């Protein structure tokens, strides 16, 4: 159930964030993400701010870090586009 990220597309705004395959999504702003709709639920809510912080647990690594995602290039189609993928993500 949990969002673990299966790739990565080169050059995105989670490659820049340095996400890595494997990486498991632990909370976007100190709200905790159990699955990938939670996810997708909290970046909506970003749409229009500059930047997010995600908490992530690397693969099985006991470590959670806070990473800082760059939005000011961000944009997707909400009504159209997933957001998980428009960060360069593609769930496991
Ligand atoms: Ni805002």
Redesign the pocket.
């Given at each position: 159930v949990r969002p673990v990220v299966g790739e990565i597309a080169a050059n995105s705004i989670a490659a820049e964030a340095q996400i890595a395959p494997g990486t498991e999504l632990k909370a976007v702003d100190g709200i905790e993400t159990p699955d990938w709709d939670a996810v997708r639920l909290q970046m909506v809510?970003?749409?229009?701010?500059e930047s997010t912080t995600i908490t992530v647990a690397p693969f099985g690594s006991d470590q959670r870090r806070d990473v800082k995602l760059d939005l000011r290039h961000w944009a997707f189609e909400p009504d159209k586009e997933d957001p998980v993928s428009s960060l360069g993500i593609r769930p496991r």
């Open positions: 809510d970003k749409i229009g701010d």
